[PDB]
Structure formats: C-alpha cells, structure tokens
Amino acid sequence: KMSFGEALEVLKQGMQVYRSGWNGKNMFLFLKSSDALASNEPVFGNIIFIKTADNKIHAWVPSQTDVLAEDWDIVS
Amino acid sequence: KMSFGEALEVLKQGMQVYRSGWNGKNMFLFLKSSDALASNEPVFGNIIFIKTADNKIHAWVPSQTDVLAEDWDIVS
Amino acid sequence: KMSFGEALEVLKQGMQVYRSGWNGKNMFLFLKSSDALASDFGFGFGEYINEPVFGNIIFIKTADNKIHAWVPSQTDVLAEDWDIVS
Amino acid sequence: KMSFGEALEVLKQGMQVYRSGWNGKNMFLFLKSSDALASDFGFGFGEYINEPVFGNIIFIKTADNKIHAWVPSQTDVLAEDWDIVS
Ligand SMILES: Nc1ncnc2c1ncn2[C@@H]1O[C@@H]2COP(=O)(O)OP(=O)(O)OC[C@H]3O[C@@H](O[C@@H]1[C@@H]2O)[C@H](O)[C@@H]3O
Ligand SMILES: Nc1ncnc2c1ncn2[C@@H]1O[C@@H]2COP(=O)(O)OP(=O)(O)OC[C@H]3O[C@@H](O[C@@H]1[C@@H]2O)[C@H](O)[C@@H]3O
Numbered sequence: 340k341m342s343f344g345e346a347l348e349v350l351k352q353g354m355q356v357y358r359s360g361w362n363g364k365n366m367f368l369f370l371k372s373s374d375a376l377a378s379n380e381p382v383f384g385n386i387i388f389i390k391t392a393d394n395k396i397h398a399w400v401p402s403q404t405d406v407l408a409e410d411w412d413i414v415s
Numbered sequence: 416k417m418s419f420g421e422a423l424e425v426l427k428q429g430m431q432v433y434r435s436g437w438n439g440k441n442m443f444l445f446l447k448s449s450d451a452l453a454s455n456e457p458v459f460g461n462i463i464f465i466k467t468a469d470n471k472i473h474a475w476v477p478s479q480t481d482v483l484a485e486d487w488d489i490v491s
Numbered sequence: 492k493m494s495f496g497e498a499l500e501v502l503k504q505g506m507q508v509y510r511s512g513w514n515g516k517n518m519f520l521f522l523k524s525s526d527a528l529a530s531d532f533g534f535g536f537g538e539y540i541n542e543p544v545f546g547n548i549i550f551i552k553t554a555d556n557k558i559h560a561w562v563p564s565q566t567d568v569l570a571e572d573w574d575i576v577s
Numbered sequence: 578k579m580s581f582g583e584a585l586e587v588l589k590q591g592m593q594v595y596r597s598g599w600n601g602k603n604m605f606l607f608l609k610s611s612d613a614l615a616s617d618f619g620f621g622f623g624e625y626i627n628e629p630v631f632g633n634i635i636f637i638k639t640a641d642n643k644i645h646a647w648v649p650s651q652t653d654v655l656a657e658d659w660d661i662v663s
Contacts (some may be wrong), residue, residue: 344496347568351527362600362640381470385569388474391652392600394457398464398474400650401563403549404639406499420582423654438514438554461655467566468514476564477649479635480553482585483608546645559632562648 341411344346344399350387355414363392367414368399417487419477426463431490434481439468443490444475498573502549507576510567515554520561523548563572584659588635590638593662596653601640605662606647 341349346356357367367390373383374406390401417425422432426446443466449459463491465475493501498508502522509519523531528545530537533547537543579587584594588608595605609617614631616623623629637647 342496342499344499346561347496351569359480364600370569376472379470381466381472381573382641384467384473384566386469386474387565387568390457391460393598395460396452396457397460398462398651399565400476400562400648400652401565402648402650403561403563403646404546406549406568407503407547418582418585420585423582427655434650455580460652463651463654469512471566474565475651476562476566477654478564479560479569479647479649480632482635482649482654483555483633485590490595504640538646544642544644546639548646553632556630557632558630560634 340409341384341413342409343406349413350383355407356411359410359412360404360408361371366390366392372405416485417489418485419482422487425489427461428483433490434484435483435486435488436480442466442468450465493573494571495568501575508573509576510570510572511574512566512572514571517552518554519552521550521552522551524538579659580657581654581659587661590648594659595662596656596658597660598652598656598658603638604640605638607636609636 340359342358342390350368353370355367355369368387369390370385372385376383376386387399389397392395404414416435417432425432426444429446431443431445444463445466445467446461446463448461451457452462463475465473501508502520505522506518507521524547525545526537527541528548529540529543533540549561551559553559587594588606591608592607610633611629611631612623613617614634615626615629632653635647639644644654
C-alpha cells in the first residue's frame with residue numbers, strides 16, 4: 340500500500356499511520372510539532388510517538404524494515 | 416569509562432549523559448518521566464530525549480554503536 | 492535537497508545517500524537487498540533460494556571508515572537535507 | 578528478569594537474549610563482534626587484520642525466521658523483562 344515516505348507526509352499533516360506487518364495489534368504513530376511540545380535556548384523539534392500494544396505512549400524508533408516497508412496505512 | 420547500562424541508570428535518576436565518541440559537540444541525553452510528560456486511556460512511558468548539536472530537542476534513537484559503547488560519561 | 496522518502500527511492504536503486512546536516516564527514520548509506528545478499532553469499536545458487544534468511548540491511552559508512560548497520564534516527568527520518576553521493 | 582544493561586553483558590558473551598514483552602514470538606538477539614566478523618569472513622587471515630572494516634553488528638532473529646539488523650527501540654532499552662534464550 341503506502342511507502343514510508345508517503346506515511347511521513349501523512350504524519351506531518353496530523354494523521355495516524357501504522358504497518359500491517361507489525362506483530363503488535365492496535366498500534367499507530369503520530370507526530371507532535373515543536374510548538375505543541377513546549378506546552379538562545381534550545382527549541383523542540385518534531386517528535387514521532389508510538390501508541391504501543393499495551394496502551395502506552397513512547398518515542399518511536401524506526402526499524403530498518405519499517406523504513407523500507409510498503410505496507411503502511413492510515414488509521415481510519 | 417561508563418557502559419550504556421550504567422548510563423541508563425544515570426538517566427533514570429535525572430542526570431544527563433553523552434558519548435565522547437560522538438561526532439557532534441555539546442550533545443547530551445535526558446529522560447523525562449511519564450508524569451512529567453503529561454504536563455482506560457493510554458498513559459505515557461519514559462522518553463529519552465537528545466539535545467542535538469544545533470540546539471534542538473528530539474526523541475533519541477540509539478545506534479548499535481551507542482548501545483555497545485564503553486565511552487559514556489555524565490554531563491558535569 | 493530531497494526528503495527521506497526520496498532518498499529511500501535512491502537507496503532502493505543501488506545508489507548512496509547522505510545528509511549534509513550530519514556531524515560526521517564523508518559518511519553515506521547504502522542498501523543491501525535480500526536478493527543482493529542471497530546472491531553475493533550464494534556462490535551461484537542465490538537465484539534458487541526463493542526465501543532468503545537475510546532481510547534487507549541498510550549499512551552506514553561511518554566517519555571512521557568502518558561499516559555499521561544504520562539505525563534511522565528521528566532527525567534523519569524527518570530531515571530534508573538528503574542528497575546523492577556524486 | 579534482567580535489565581537491558583545486563584542483557585548487553587550476556588550479548589557480549591556470545592549468548593542470545595530476548596524480551597518476554599515483545600509482540601512477536603520465538604525472537605532473539607545475537608551479537609556479531611568485529612573480531613567474529615573478521616574471522617568468519619577472513620578465510621584464516623582474520624587474526625592479522627588489526628583494524629577490520631565491519632563494526633559490531635546486533636542481529637535480530639525475527640518472527641518470520643528472517644535475520645535483520647536490530648534497531649534498539651526506547652521501549653526495549655528501558656524495559657526490565659530481558660532473559661537468556663535457554
Ligand atoms: N559509529 C556509528 N555507528 C553507527 N551509526 C552511527 C555512527 N556514527 C554516527 N552514526 C549515525 O549516523 C548518522 C549521522 O551521524 P553523525 O550525525 O555524523 O554523528 P552523531 O549525530 O553525533 O551521532 C550520535 C547520534 O546520531 C545517531 O546516529 C548517527 C546518525 O543517524 C544516533 O542517534 C546517535 O546517538
Ligand atoms: N521484521 C523486523 N525487522 C527488524 N526489526 C523488527 C522486526 N520486527 C520486530 N522488530 C523489532 O524487534 C523488537 C520486537 O518486535 P515486536 O515487538 O515483536 O513487534 P512490533 O513491536 O509490533 O514492531 C514494531 C516496532 O517494534 C520495533 O522494532 C521491533 C522491536 O524492537 C520498532 O520500533 C517497530 O516500529
């Protein structure tokens with residue numbers, strides 16, 4: 340379906356994405372902007388989060404398989 | 416000096432760590448707890464951040480070299 | 492000059508990409524597909540494997556001239572300063 | 578049962594570790610040190626390399642019985658449910 344580059348633009352626009360090939364069920368990613376994160380100092384940058392399979396919110400770490408996969412989809 | 420497992424316990428205690436082998440200068444990590452992040456719903460988990468070389472705050476992604484390295488140190 | 496998604500297309504075509512915003516110098520990524528690994532280590536039998544054991548691996552030629560498995564950071568994934576090694 | 582730092586000690590000793598909290602089944606990590614890679618691909622000359630080109634690589638035996646380069650997630654790094662493959 341969707342590539343990771345396409346899934347990123349969906350994330351940069353505020354929607355939630357996921358991979359059908361993931362082992363965990365009901366997981367998704369969402370991107371929070373630097374302005375929303377604050378709510379010559381260093382400023383925040385965009386951060387991708389992950390809602391895990393056990394209903395927990397962590398900072399997301401992409402696997403090599405995630406980045407190369409073609410099975411991304413939008414959370415409906 | 417310090418291993419990554421030792422550097423993690425320093426992070427879990429609120430201090431800042433870094434690797435001397437990193438290419439970027441003046442970078443460090445810090446861990447924010449789930450309680451501090453909020454400020455059958457999914458709850459936050461601990462998140463490791465990184466102050467980058469260009470004074471930006473991102474979610475940290477460990478390289479394989481980071482995890483196996485022995486050159487960790489505490490920010491003084 | 493290009494995003495990470497565009498750099499992935501360049502990576503999947505056997506080319507090398509890099510970020511000008513990286514701290515280290517003379518670094519680049521390259522992709523070893525499952526078929527490339529099966530062929531390079533297959534001794535002429537790789538075309539008959541159908542299901543190789545090694546998945547796709549992205550490598551990074553680091554600043555120390557070593558070769559590591561590349562871990563995509565959120566800064567790299569969200570960056571817009573990717574380019575092709577010329 | 579053990580933390581990630583303890584699992585790293587087990588990894589650096591040639592043993593395999595895993596997380597009971599992982600979603601996939603029958604998965605484990607294993608480490609290929611720089612010396613192991615230089616020896617296994619060196620054809621009896623690996624002891625004379627001094628500075629090998631390949632760094633240490635952590636691999637993951639994934640649920641599909643494939644072998645990938647393992648990317649340490651923040652959940653894995655902070656987890657406390659690591660154990661040794663028996
Ligand atoms: N010896 C090595 N082995 C494996 N990978 C390496 C590496 N050296 C650099 N990388 C990676 O290659 C890209 C550019 O690296 P650099 O930006 O030039 O250096 P630095 O940012 O200071 O590394 C610190 C942070 O960068 C991130 O990984 C970087 C980054 O994705 C990661 O989060 C790390 O904690
Ligand atoms: N085919 C594969 N190739 C490479 N690595 C793979 C993999 N399958 C799983 N992994 C990794 O191995 C550990 C346990 O994996 P699982 O927990 O059993 O599955 P899942 O969490 O749903 O993967 C989704 C998220 O897990 C994270 O990576 C996982 C996780 O570190 C990563 O952030 C990913 O976005």
